[PDB]
Design a protein around this nucleic acid. Structure first.
Lengths: 81, 129
DNA sequence: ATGCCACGTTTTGCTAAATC
DNA sequence: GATTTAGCAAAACGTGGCAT
């Protein structure tokens, strides 16, 4: 599996307005992001279109499709901040 | 309840600081621009002020000022360019803002070696800066 | 909790000017 | 030439309260 795919969106090391805003949409894992529709996520009254570049980068560089259903992504310990 | 980490009134504002920082390099991104990233100017200002401690429009200028100052010392990017790039209508405008903030002219600040991190607001806006 | 006006303030905008 | 400055006006803003 990918080391950053199983990481929290808040700790993915991206831009300023991206990682922090993602964890505010009940997304504390990249696994949810890869199955999230950008057309709706980037339309949220907070998310910026400039964040799409970084978000799409993670999926593209990992070979993940838009809304690609993952077989297993949430482990034993999964909490929020 | 039972968290002792973040506040509900905080999380709604804990997604504005980062928004501004990643949108102040070129656009203005004031309360009216952040309206689509939160609530109406008059309401967002109140919420922002009661969370960060500083005013929104005040913060925008403060952060942009120090950001330009750094690019005047570390970088050699033209003042006119920095102005137009940061959203200023003219270099004269930037010169006015800079002088009324750092008290030192943008061009002089670039040559002042004694000048350092003074009045430099950081992208935190929660603990004095 | 969300929306708004008003008072005021800063900045801004605008033409120019002055200095280096 | 370059930079800085002269004022004027406006815009927003600074907030308070107000309204839903």
């Amino acid at each position: 599996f990918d080391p950053i795919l199983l990481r929290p969106v808040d700790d993915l090391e991206l831009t300023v307005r991206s990682a922090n805003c993602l964890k505010a949409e009940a997304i504390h894992y990249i696994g949810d992001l890869v199955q999230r529709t950008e057309v709706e996520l980037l339309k949220t009254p907070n998310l910026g279109k400039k964040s799409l570049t970084e978000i799409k980068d993670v999926l593209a560089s990992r070979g993940l499709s838009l809304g690609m259903r993952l077989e297993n992504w949430p482990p034993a310990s999964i909490a929020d901040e | 309840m039972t968290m002792s980490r973040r506040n509900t009134d905080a999380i709604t504002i804990h997604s504005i600081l980062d928004w501004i920082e990643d949108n102040l390099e070129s656009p203005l991104s004031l309360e009216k621009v952040s309206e689509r990233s939160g609530y109406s100017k008059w309401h967002l200002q109140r919420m922002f002020k009661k969370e960060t401690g500083h005013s929104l429009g005040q913060y925008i200028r403060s952060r942009k000022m120090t950001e330009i100052a750094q690019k005047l010392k570390e970088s050699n990017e033209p003042i006119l360019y920095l102005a137009e790039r940061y959203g200023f209508e003219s270099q004269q405008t930037l010169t006015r803002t800079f002088k009324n903030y750092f008290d030192v002219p943008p061009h002089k600040y670039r040559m002042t070696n004694m000048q350092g991190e003074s009045r430099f607001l950081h992208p935190l806006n929660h603990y004095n800066s």
